[PDB]
Amino acid sequence: TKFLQSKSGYLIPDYELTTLSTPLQFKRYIKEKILPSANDPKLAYKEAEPNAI
Amino acid sequence: LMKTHKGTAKRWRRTGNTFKRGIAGRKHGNIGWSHRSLKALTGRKIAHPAYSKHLKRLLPYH
Amino acid sequence: APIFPKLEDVKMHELIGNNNFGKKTYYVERSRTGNLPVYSAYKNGGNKIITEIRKIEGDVIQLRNDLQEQLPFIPKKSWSVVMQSKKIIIKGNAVEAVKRVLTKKF
Amino acid sequence: LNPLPNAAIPPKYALVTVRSFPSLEPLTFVPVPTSTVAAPLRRDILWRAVVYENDNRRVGASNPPGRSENGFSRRKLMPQKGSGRARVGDANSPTRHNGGRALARTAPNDYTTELPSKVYSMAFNNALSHQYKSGKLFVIGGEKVDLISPTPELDLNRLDLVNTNTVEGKEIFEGEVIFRKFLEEFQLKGKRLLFITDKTREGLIKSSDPYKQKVDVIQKELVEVNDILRAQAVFIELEALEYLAMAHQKEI
Amino acid sequence: VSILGQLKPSDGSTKSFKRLGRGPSSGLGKTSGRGQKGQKARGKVKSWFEGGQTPIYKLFPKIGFTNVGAKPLKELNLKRIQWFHDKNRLHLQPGEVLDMNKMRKLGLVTGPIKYGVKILASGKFHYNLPIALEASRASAKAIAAIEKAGGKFTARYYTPLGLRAHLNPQWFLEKRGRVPLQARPTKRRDIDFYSKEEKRGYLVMEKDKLLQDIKEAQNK
Amino acid sequence: YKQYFDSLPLKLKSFFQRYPPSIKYSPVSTSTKAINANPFLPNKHPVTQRFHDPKYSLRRMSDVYKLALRYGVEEFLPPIENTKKLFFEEKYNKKTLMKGVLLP
RNA sequence: AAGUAACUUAAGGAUAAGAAAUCAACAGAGAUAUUAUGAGUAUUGGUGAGAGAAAAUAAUAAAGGUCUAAUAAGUAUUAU
RNA sequence: AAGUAAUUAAUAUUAGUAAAACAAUAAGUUAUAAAUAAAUAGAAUAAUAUAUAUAUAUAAAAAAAUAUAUAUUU
RNA sequence: AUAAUAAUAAUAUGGUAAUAGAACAUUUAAUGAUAAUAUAUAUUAGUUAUUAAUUAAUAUAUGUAUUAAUUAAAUAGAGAA
Ligand SMILES: [Mg+2]
Ligand SMILES: [Mg+2]
Ligand SMILES: [Mg+2]
Ligand SMILES: [Mg+2]
Ligand SMILES: [Mg+2]
Ligand SMILES: [Mg+2]
Ligand SMILES: [Mg+2]
Ligand SMILES: [Mg+2]
Ligand SMILES: [Mg+2]
Ligand SMILES: [Mg+2]
Ligand SMILES: [Mg+2]
Ligand SMILES: [Mg+2]
Ligand SMILES: [Mg+2]
Ligand SMILES: [Mg+2]
Ligand SMILES: [Mg+2]
Ligand SMILES: [Mg+2]
Ligand SMILES: [Mg+2]
Ligand SMILES: [Mg+2]
């Protein structure tokens, strides 16, 4: 997980790390959450407006 | 803070979720009356629900 | 004794997101003194008796359904599961029966 | 035959990564118990804790002058009858424009509310768990525990900056710069930060002081539910986190 | 965003307080729930003021007296002890008696034991413990149940200080380097009670010195 | 030994300083002028022939004695025989029961 | 209501109190002073209105004990 | 320009904990047993009251009143 | 076995004293994007079953809401002294 984080550039949260039991699961998570935001910066999650569409 | 009505405390004692009291009319002038009839007034009596609230307010720590 | 144990002794199944505890399963933790958390409660000025069941982890609906299956004699209607605190209220003083049902597993 | 088929045993340990400070680098995992760091998020308990804390915090300095406090004479301004005007007493009445306030408060106004200790502990746990879920709970340590990856050369295991007090070349100092660099790295310049130390980290607070409006460095003992929840990312020492867990554990 | 701007109380916790004297459609309009024009409307009569009739704290005669010499024991039923034993909370080494201090330690009795403990018999049927008990006193039925179980009761005298010392001997040691000595029964009634074999009083059961001294005095 | 002595409570230490154990103080009441005059007893003044009150008033004396008992330094204090106070186990043992207890 | 308001007099940075002719109860404690529990309990009242302790356990608190008196008489006590 | 505050008591609703709660320094308050003016009395001898506990009464019952009992204490 | 919305059938919906339930305006505290193409206040005309808010135009201010929302509270609403 540390290696994955280092290569990625991004931080996978502690809870997520605890949950995900396989490399495949980790990959799937990454594809879901970080990837789309990385692709499109307007699509990214903002803190002050968490319920944005 | 609130305090107990001492006269009321003297008159009334606790009995679970009610108060018990002595009967009125058995301190003098008893002669002439029937003794059996008088025996009704010798014991104690539970508080009537009409004045239960009043009693509670008088005796906050009971 | 130690609050956080070492990394070696902790197994994988002990961690969160393992063994599938969320999906349609539950637990009912005993009290500090070591008794089943099932209590009589006398609401509305002693007029409304109800049996409360506390300390439920996981799916409460499933647990309720299981209890109903165990105790068919209690009606279906009288099983109010409050979701905010996760506790399941029953109408009668049905404490002892509930305890009996739970004891075997919890 | 099978009485409670869907009964099962819950998970009991969540892994939190133990990091080196200046650069948040994974050194080890540490399994903290699920009750501290992964409780179900009960909002009502959290609310109770917050409101109580707010009530405790109150100064309560409202001190408007009542008709006694207000400083007019006690004299009757116009005689009761034979004036051709409404009846008046002294000039202090709430009814009149210069008079004192009706039902006036008098400072200090005690706004202190109570909470059960257990409830408060539960709330404290709950807030921490919520923070962990968010991905806003950075556990820094490695001194006591057995490591996997070794600590970096320029980082350190405690939550502090080195040679902060030293300032020889220019008025600018190194610990501040390091802090700024750290902020730049993890993209939390304007965000609220909450550094839960164990012992007094003087250099850290000095480094912070530039960003005092957003960064709050607190001890292990004086940290609050409010402080934890307000924070955009908490930075807790492993030892401090252990202590908190011990404090707010349900007793057996 | 932080949770701090989205916290509510639990449903059913809070209420809106009834706010008076604030417009007609509010409900609590001009009169503000007071009614109309009386003493209660603008002033204060007492809640229990009965009008002038002889009140319910005057009609009736005053009854009884407060026995200041009374010292109410906390009651412990055999049933509770049995339950504790079943639960495996009744931790006793062989020979060690279940004394009032011991009960407190275990959590059999809980809250402040000011004057003592009486052992009552509410689960005398299912009581089967051969352990030895010791309290301020016991019910006759309770005693009989204990005897049947193969147990052994002893009613033991304790002045309030002596009781306190018994409950928490370490405190006294900490303060003064010495636990205080247990007093003799000075009172006549107390002496009489513990001199009874039927009560299983300690003065007869242990064959005390005080009782012997009294007997000698009587003789002489 | 010196360190242990120093570790003794304050009042006891003060007493030892101002009435030291080298002097064998009297068991009985004495002249106030005497060197061996017991501070716990009421000593008579030789000229006036009036009993002076004890140098250590009764409470203070009792406290001192209890301190000595605690640290096992009783015999170095001067004797409390003719002061009517007994203490603890000795008091318990030596006392006669009241007339009311023995003969109701 | 209240030994309150008020008037009068006198002192000090504070004053007052303070090292038991004290409490307690046959076991014991050990200056003062303030607060919490004890407790609106005991106690008391045209037994109405109402008034209401102490012991004990906690804090706060300072080194907290220490002679300065030839050990105290119109004093204790009694009556009123 | 007008139902406010403080110290208390009783109800209710929810939430925490639960045969315990609050508090953890001990101490205390409430609960855990019902009575009785008060006293050294106090809940199935073999089961629902027809048993038991207390107060009146008594040799002990009966009698009035309230309370206690039909894997798990409330 | 819930919630929201919408159907159908039925019953109910005058109200002083009073009781109960649910909202809104205002001000402060906690959390908090955004921005002169914006925000606030005012006027006029529209809109939403409408004490309220919103749209447009016009005016004046301000490089800007302790803003929306949830909580906590109130010197929280005036034709009646
Ligand atoms: Mg007749
Ligand atoms: Mg509040
Ligand atoms: Mg109306
Ligand atoms: Mg009117
Ligand atoms: Mg009227
Ligand atoms: Mg009349
Ligand atoms: Mg007076
Ligand atoms: Mg005066
Ligand atoms: Mg002075
Ligand atoms: Mg007091
Ligand atoms: Mg003298
Ligand atoms: Mg003298
Ligand atoms: Mg006189
Ligand atoms: Mg009799
Ligand atoms: Mg209507
Ligand atoms: Mg106003
Ligand atoms: Mg106006
Ligand atoms: Mg109008």
Expressed in angstroms, the distance from the first to the final Cα of chain C is: 24
Q: Taking the CA atoms of chain C, what radius of gyration do you get in angstroms?
A: 16
User: Which neighbouring-strand residues pair with C38?
Assistant: C53
- Closest-approach residue (CA) in chain F for E218: F103
Chain E residues whose beta carbon lies within 8 Å of the beta carbon of residue B51: 56
Q: Are E58 and B54 within 8 A, CB to CB?
A: no
Question: Subunits with at least 3 CB pairs below 8 A relative to chain C?
Answer: A, D, E
Selected residue of C15, C19, C21, C23 to mutate for chain A interface (largest A Cβ count, 10 A)? C15
- How far is it, in rounded angstroms, from Cα C78 to Cα C91? 5
Helix ranges, D99-142 (H):
117-134
Q: Do E7 and D232 touch (CB under 8 A)?
A: no
Chains adjacent to A (≥3 CB pairs closer than 8 angstroms): C, D, E
Question: Angle at CA B22, nearest 5°, toward B18 and B27?
Answer: 170
Centroid of ligand 11 to alpha carbon of F55 (angstroms) = 10
Helical (H) or strand (E) element with D144: none
DSSP D11: P
Please name the residues in contact with E45: beta carbons below 8 A apart, sequence gap of 6 or more.
Answer: E39
For residue E57, which phi and psi values (nearest 5 degrees)?
-120, 40
Query: Token pair for residue C98?
Result: 């509930």
Task: Annotate E80-93 with DSSP letters as a single string.
Answer: HHHHHHHHT-----
Chain A hits for D149, CB-CB cut-off 8 Å, are: 2
Distance of CA C28 to the CA centre of its chain: 4
The whole-angstrom distance between E101's CA and the closest CA on chain D is 22
Backbone CA torsion sign across E30, E35, E38, E40: negative
The E 143-162 residues near strand G by Cβ under 7 Å are: 159-162
Structure method: cryo-EM
Residue nearest to nucleotide I32 (CA to C1'): A48
Q: Is D13 exposed, middle or buried (0-12, 13-18, 19+ CB in 10 A)?
A: buried
Nearest to D64 by CA among D32, D29, D94, D22: D94
Q: Any chain E CB within 8 A of the CB of C44?
A: no
Nucleotide H14: closest residue by CA–C1' = E13
Instruction: Indicate the pairing of strand D13-20 with strand C56-58.
Output: unpaired
Contact C41, C52 (CB under 8 A): yes
Q: How many Cα neighbours within 13 Å face the side chain of D85?
A: 6
CA-CA distance, C23 to C40, in Å (whole number)?
30
Tokens 């480094």 — which residue?
A: D207
- The contacts of residue E91 (CB under 8 Å, 6+ apart) are E106
Residue E128 makes CB contacts below 8 A (sequence gap 6+) with E82, E149
Of F70, F89, F100, the CB nearest to E177: F70
CB C63 within 8 A of CB D43: no
Cα gap F30→F43, rounded to integer Å: 5
Cβ count within 10 A of residue E6:
11
φ, ψ of residue C31 in degrees (nearest 5) = -70, 180
Phi, psi (rounded to 5 degrees) for D30 = -135, 120
Instruction: For chain E, say whether C32 makes contact (Cβ under 8 Å).
Output: no
- CA–CA dist D68, D227 (Å, integer): 42
- C16 part of contact set with chain A, CB < 8 Å: yes
Q: How many angstroms separate the Cα of E97 from the Cα of each of A44, E130, E134, E183? A: 71, 11, 7, 21
- Cβ of C18 within 8 Å of Cβ of A20? The answer is no
F 24-63 residues, CB < 7 A, strand G: 32, 45, 47-48, 50-53, 55, 57-60, 62-63
Q: DSSP E strands: which ranges in chain E?
A: 74-77, 117-120, 137-138
> Cα separation of E47 and E40, whole Å?
10
CB contact (8 A) between residue D149 and residue A2:
yes
At which residue do the structure tokens 């030789």 appear? F46
CA-CA distance, F8 to F11, in Å (whole number)? Answer: 9
* Terminal Cα-to-Cα distance of chain F (whole angstroms): 54
Residue E201 CA to residue D154 CA, distance in Å, equals: 77
Residue with the two structure tokens 């290569």: A7
For chain C, the residue count is 106
DSSP symbols for E31-87: STTS-SSSTTTSS---TT--BTBPPTTTSSPP-----TT--PPEEEEHHHHHHHHHH
By the CB criterion, residues less than 5 angstroms from ion ligand 11 are F 53
Distance between CA atoms of residues D34 and D12, nearest Å: 5
Give the whole-angstrom CA distance, residue D220 versus residue D232. 18
In what helix (H) or strand (E) does residue E204 lie, and over which residues does it extend? helix E202-205
In angstroms, the CA of F57 and the C1' of G63 are apart by: 21
Residue of F46, F35, F43, F39 lying closest to F65 (CA atoms): F39
Q: Could you tell me if C52 and C89 are in contact, meaning their C-beta atoms sit under 8 angstroms apart?
A: yes
Rounded to whole angstroms, how far apart are CA atoms E205 and F101?
A: 20
Q: Which residues are paired to E55 by β-bridges?
A: none
Cα E188 to ligand 14 centre (Å): 23
* β-pairing verdict for C87-90 and C79-82: antiparallel
Give chain D's end-to-end CA distance (angstroms, integer): 33
Gap between the Cα atoms of E146 and E148, Å rounded: 5
- Asked whether F66 and F77 are in contact (CB, 8 A), the reply is no
Resolution of the structure, angstroms: 5.0
Task: Please tell me the distance from the alpha carbon of residue F29 to that of residue E210, in angstroms, as a whole number.
Answer: 35
Which residue, A4, A5, E3, is CA-closest to D186? A5
Find out whether D22 and D178 touch, Cβ atoms under 8 Å: yes
Q: Round to a whole number and report the distance in Å from the CA of D4 to the C1' of G11.
A: 85
Helix H or strand E encompassing D210: none
Residue of E nearest to D130 (CA): E3
Q: What DSSP designation does E28 have? A: S
C-alpha distances out from residue F12 to C18, C58, E218, Å = 68, 66, 45
Half-sphere exposure of E48 (CA within 13 A, CB side): 17
Helix E78-87 and helix E140-149, axial crossing angle in degrees, nearest 10: 40
Nearest ligand to the C-alpha atom of residue E35: 5
Q: Which ligand is nearest to the CA of E33?
A: 3
Sequence-distant (6+) residues with CB within 8 A of C30 are: C36, C37, C55, C106
Q: Which residues make beta-bridge pairs with D33?
A: D13
Torsion angle defined by CA atoms of residues E123, E126, E131 and E132, in that order, rounded to the nearest 10 degrees: 40
User: In angstroms, rounded to a whole number, what is the distance separating the alpha carbons of residues C81 and C75?
Assistant: 14
